[PDB]
Write a protein that binds this ligand. Structure first.
Ligand SMILES: *[C@@H]1O[C@H](CO[C@@H]2O[C@@H](C)[C@@H](O)[C@@H](O)[C@@H]2O)[C@@H](O[C@@H]2O[C@H](CO)[C@@H](O[C@@H]3O[C@H](CO[C@H]4O[C@H](CO)[C@@H](O)[C@H](O)[C@@H]4O[C@@H]4O[C@H](CO)[C@@H](O)[C@H](O)[C@H]4NC(C)=O)[C@@H](O)[C@H](O[C@H]4O[C@H](CO)[C@@H](O)[C@H](O)[C@@H]4O[C@@H]4O[C@H](CO)[C@@H](O)[C@H](O)[C@H]4NC(C)=O)[C@@H]3O)[C@H](O)[C@H]2NC(C)=O)[C@H](O)[C@H]1NC(C)=O
Ligand SMILES: *[C@@H]1O[C@H](CO[C@@H]2O[C@@H](C)[C@@H](O)[C@@H](O)[C@@H]2O)[C@@H](O[C@@H]2O[C@H](CO)[C@@H](O[C@@H]3O[C@H](CO[C@H]4O[C@H](CO)[C@@H](O)[C@H](O)[C@@H]4O)[C@@H](O)[C@H](O[C@H]4O[C@H](CO)[C@@H](O)[C@H](O)[C@@H]4O)[C@@H]3O)[C@H](O)[C@H]2NC(C)=O)[C@H](O)[C@H]1NC(C)=O
Ligand SMILES: [Cl-]
Ligand SMILES: [Cl-]
Ligand SMILES: [Cl-]
Ligand SMILES: [Cl-]
Lengths: 522, 518
């Protein structure tokens, strides 16, 4: 049967993979783990663009998971059970490849490149196992890594540190895929980039980037786009000043600062890094030559065909758990709501006068605390995820096919160990995209969930093959046009039109107009 | 007006010098002999290029670099060269920048790739000062491994090949990393080159290894399918070098150790056998044959200028490849046998001789006319038909601007036979504003105006991916109407250049070859 130790060519040398079986298939998978796509970004290559990797002499071991990039532990008890024993290092520019075991140089399979999320400060490729997706849909799955936190996103806003190191690493990984994936049996002309949350923001940033042109044929943006408010910044000023200050560096010049910051060891860099729970991309002038808003609004914007979507409860549970650890949302009453919404307006970078606009839009005359709290979670999910997705879909759909989804399936394994109000939380679709297969865990699923995961994997792989999710036997997914149709993605399939049109009117026209009226009372 | 400018690179500081260009106000900073790769010597012979080493202090950028190892077989050519030596240590580039420019000036960048059949040439023949000064542009002249050292391949892991092409990639990666320090815009890099430099540029256009390293391409009298400069098989270069070296190894691992042991004189002796050497389909720089890469529905070329001259086989190439002047012996009596010999060189069966004769000579009796028809046919096969085929493949995916250059240079007109129109290379004089290594060529007022037009077309293309600007004659983009610029003192536009010849070479002759079979 299939080879236990497959050897494959790369530009830098041969790599030895291993053979893996997935549940309930004769189809086996070849894995190639920890392949370097760039030189380790250490010493003078810290806060520098990625350089081309060194050649090696022998057959390189491709059976070991790579180091994750430097990051902090900011429950997560379960993440360390369902993770390999991964170590952490500045030496982390590696990718992992999952290929059907039949495939070899020239098999010409579609390629799906997974970009992990984690607020551009946490995560790793080795959390994700592409074996089930690879095996079921006859597809090459590539999981990449990129610099995170200060090492990924530090910027002086000048030539000494333009920034977006992590995004340049993602470019370097996609260039590697163009140059090498044919040797693994992938088709470099059918590469689809996909990612969730900050991975969606990453994918969406590639879609607008002149630097990423020709590195992929299609894009999938799950619960994250390039204008996700906390992951993009016009100014480098605060990351510049905070890192310069905390590092203790003498900082008369950016040139002196860069020498001092390159002198810091890993423990010193981890201490500076821990301050940033989230970190934004900047307008670096290279990867993002302008703000993603300006790039999408451009008459000369030429996006690839795209899938864009969101879940029906983006702010249901996991994000409130992380960003409201004291459970203040459960204290919301009609009495407290005005003050909570003034505090929310400031976090959304609105004037505090907008608190009452948010209240009228999302809560109206509602007195019931349970209802008020659900309206509050709706409003947050809309601001952070749903409105940005709808805006980006609107900008892309005049130039290229957009297929829009709202994912609605509450996962069976979580529904009893979460509050009963939680529908499809942030990240709930990832379980179905990967066929319930992750690092060292097969998640439990119902028959219905298996059928829905098969449907989602075939939509995604069909899109990777053809730039269209549709095929005979899958429910119809209409392309998004002036009717603004979207897939209601659940066990029972349906189609809607103009998702949250009144909310989109509120956020994009009503609220900016009312802010402009405040400047008139002043 | 700085006499000794200092500029930053990733590997350290360089000291340039100040140059003034004839009768004009813009001065130029030059930075010569900058390393873009580690010397490809010892274990780095027949190996991909490594990143250059950092240096302490300020490196001298006032001296021209060594040329790569090569053989000479034009006495007065070396009179117009600076006194440069030859070495395996030759991975250097030269930079010409307007003297006003500094780190962040964000000028367009033009990267010149020299020709010479992938066996001869050097950056130091070319002086970018006049182009840099006239058009406010950074001009970079690169070097790359030539001959056996550039293009030896075992067709396997031990020597995949295309070392010279990987050096050109390494020079473009250096430009991405460093040109901002010289005042160049790394997002407006245009690669340009003539003949094997055109073939090189055209190979970058199809290469996944070169994607994102340039914004535009200019292919002067050479593309990636130029018949003698591409090979599917490494077999002949593999066996000839293995045999001549005396290495005689049963395995390519032993062969590679033996070939790395040879000194420079031993390598020059092996090298001399190859007057021309091809790129291989290595699976990496060229993942498939350039024909297949261009024919692909997923071919994504940059905007391109592609062109040829009206007399590609007029004088210089016949002088080099017909030293015995047997073209001047052609008569109606000898023509059939000459064309059977020509068919074999074009890799056609000898039966095709009479097809070539009908197509290019017909009933013609006059020896002078027959000889002109023969030179036309060779220029068409080697240059014109390949350029039109590549322009056809590119133009449905990206803007192509096509030119036929027609200007006979005034300084050569009296010296050459009167039948010679715009010979192979004649446009290079106008692209560089008649400025070369330690020579300013003499030109008429009309030639100055035409050179200013060509430099502005090329620099406009570097800035915008479109040669056009107000005051230049219109250059239409190439679409289904197949318009091209007739580039001469009097501007004009044609459609479907040599359409009957294109029909002959691309449909009639292949059909008749398939009729010889079966
Ligand atoms: C990281 O950031 C923090 C915070 O920075 C601040 O906030 C951010 C957001 C930005 O807005 C910054 O612009 C802003 O500065 C930095 O911490 C701050 O550091 C500054 C110095 O830049 C301090 O200002 C001085 O404070 C001293 C008094 O404070 C000292 O004593 C404290 C104990 O009570 C101790 O905890 C402090 O650490 C501090 O100790 C000193 O530290 C500095 C820096 O290393 C060192 O140079 C001193 O030698 C040392 N001093 C002593 C006695 O131990 C105050 O006395 C100073 O006043 C003089 O200096 C001013 C500017 O130079 C000037 O305007 C004043 O008028 C005054 O000037 C003197 O005048 C007389 C004549 O009248 C003359 O004879 C003297 O020669 C002359 N001297 C000078 C030098 O001019 C001064 O105000 C801030 O208090 C401090 N803030 C906090 C909250 O801690 C930190 O530096 C950053 N780190 C890095 C690596 O960048
Ligand atoms: C470089 O290439 C040279 C040509 O090689 C041939 O052509 C290439 C393209 C391939 O097809 C290759 O496979 C061919 O062999 C090559 O020169 C040649 O070398 C071979 C030996 O491999 C010679 O064959 C033998 O010749 C002798 C006669 O003596 C002469 O050769 C020796 C060599 O040491 C000299 O010292 C003498 O003075 C003579 O000049 C025959 O007696 C002998 O026959 C016996 O051996 C073979 C098997 O080994 C049996 O098949 C026979 O039955 C006999 O038992 C060989 O036939 C060949 O004649 C010679 N050609 C020429 C034109 O000189 C050269 O060696 C290559 N260089 C390196 C370093 O590899
Ligand atoms: Cl490396
Ligand atoms: Cl995230
Ligand atoms: Cl070096
Ligand atoms: Cl040439």
């Amino acid at each position: 049967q299939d080879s236990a130790s497959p050897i494959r060519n790369t530009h830098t040398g041969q790599v030895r993979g291993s053979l893996v079986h997935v549940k309930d298939t004769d189809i086996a998978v070849h894995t190639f783990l920890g392949i370097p796509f760039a030189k380790p970004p250490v010493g003078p290559l810290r806060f520098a663009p990625p350089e081309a990797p060194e050649p090696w002499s022998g057959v390189r071991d491709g059976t070991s998971h790579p180091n994750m990039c430097l990051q902090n532990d900011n429950d997560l008890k379960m993440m360390n059970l369902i993770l390999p024993p991964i170590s952490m290092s500045e030496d982390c520019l590696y990718l992992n490849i999952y290929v059907p075991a039949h495939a070899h140089e020239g098999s010409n399979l579609p390629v799906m490149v997974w970009i992990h999320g984690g607020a551009l400060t946490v995560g790793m490729a080795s959390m994700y196992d592409g074996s089930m997706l690879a095996a079921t849909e006859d597809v090459v799955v590539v999981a990449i890594q990129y610099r995170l936190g200060v090492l990924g996103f530090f910027s002086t806003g000048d030539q000494h540190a333009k920034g977006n190191w992590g995004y340049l690493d993602q470019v370097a990984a996609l260039r590697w895929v163009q140059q090498n994936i044919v040797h693994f049996g992938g088709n470099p002309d059918r590469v689809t980039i996909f990612g969730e949350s900050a991975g969606g923001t990453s994918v969406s940033s590639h879609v607008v980037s002149p630097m990423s042109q020709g590195l992929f044929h299609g894009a999938i943006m799950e619960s994250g786009v390039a204008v996700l408010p906390d992951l993009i910044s016009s100014s480098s000023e605060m990351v510049h000043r905070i890192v310069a200050n905390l590092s203790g560096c003498a900082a008369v010049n950016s040139e002196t600062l860069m020498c001092c910051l390159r002198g810091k060891n890993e423990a010193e860099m981890l201490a500076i890094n821990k301050v940033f729970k989230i970190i934004p991309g900047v307008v670096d002038g290279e990867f993002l030559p302008k703000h993603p808003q300006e790039l999408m609004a451009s008459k000369d914007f030429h996006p690839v065909p795209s899938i864009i979507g969101i879940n029906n409860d983006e702010y249901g549970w996991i994000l409130p758990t992380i960003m409201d650890p004291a459970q203040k949302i459960e204290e919301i009453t009609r009495k407290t709501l005005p003050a909570v919404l003034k505090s929310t307006a400031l976090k959304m970078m609105l004037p505090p006068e907008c608190g009452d606009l948010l209240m009228e839009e999302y809560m109206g005359d509602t007195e019931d605390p349970e209802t008020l709290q659900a309206q509050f979670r709706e409003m947050k999910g809309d601001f952070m995820f749903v409105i940005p997705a709808l805006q980006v879909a609107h900008f892309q759909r005049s130039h290229a096919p957009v297929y829009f989804y709202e994912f609605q399936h509450r996962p069976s394994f979580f529904k009893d160990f979460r509050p009963p109000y939680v529908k499809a939380d942030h990240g709930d679709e990832i379980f179905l995209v990967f066929g319930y297969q992750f690092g060292n865990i097969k998640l439990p699923y119902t028959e219905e969930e298996e059928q829905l995961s098969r449907r989602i994997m075939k939509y995604w792989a069909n899109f990777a093959r053809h730039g269209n999710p549709n095929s005979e036997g899958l429910p119809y997914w209409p392309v998004m046009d002036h009717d603004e149709q979207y897939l209601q993605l659940d066990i029972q399939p349906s189609v809607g039109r103009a998702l949250k049109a009144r909310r989109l009117q509120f956020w994009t026209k009503t609220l900016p107009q009312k802010i402009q009226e405040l400047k008139g009372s002043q």
